[PDB]
Amino acid sequence: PNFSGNWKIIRSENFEELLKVLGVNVMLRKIAVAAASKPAVEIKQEGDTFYIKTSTTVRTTEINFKVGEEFEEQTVDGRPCKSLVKWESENKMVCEQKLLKGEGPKTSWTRELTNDGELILTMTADDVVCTRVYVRE
Ligand SMILES: CC(/C=C/C=C(\C)c1ccc2c(c1)C(C)(C)CCC2(C)C)=C\C(=O)O
State whether residue 39 is helix, strand or coil: coil
* Residue 91 exposed, middle or buried by CB count within 10 Å (0-12, 13-18, 19+): middle
Experiment used for this model: X-ray
Q: Which fold has domain 1-137?
A: Lipocalin (2.40.128)
65-88: string of b/e by CB count within 10 Å (b at 16+)?
A: bebeeeeebebbbeeebebbbeee
Give distance in angstroms: CA of 132 to centre of ligand 1: 13
Report how far residue 33's alpha carbon sits from residue 28's, in angstroms, rounded to the nearest whole number: 9
Resolution reading in Å: 2.1
Report how far ligand 1's centroid is from the alpha carbon of 127 (Å): 19
Residue of 17, 31, 57, 129 to test ligand 1 pocket, by largest number of atoms within 8 Å of CB: 31
- Cα–Cα distances (Å) from 74 to 5, 39, 95, 119, in that order, read 23, 17, 12, 21
Give the nearest ligand 1 atom to 57 CA: 7
For the chain, what are the domain ranges?
1-137
Task: Using alpha carbons, list the distances in angstroms from residue 56 to 61, 78, 84.
Answer: 9, 15, 24
30 Cα–ligand 1 center, Å: 10
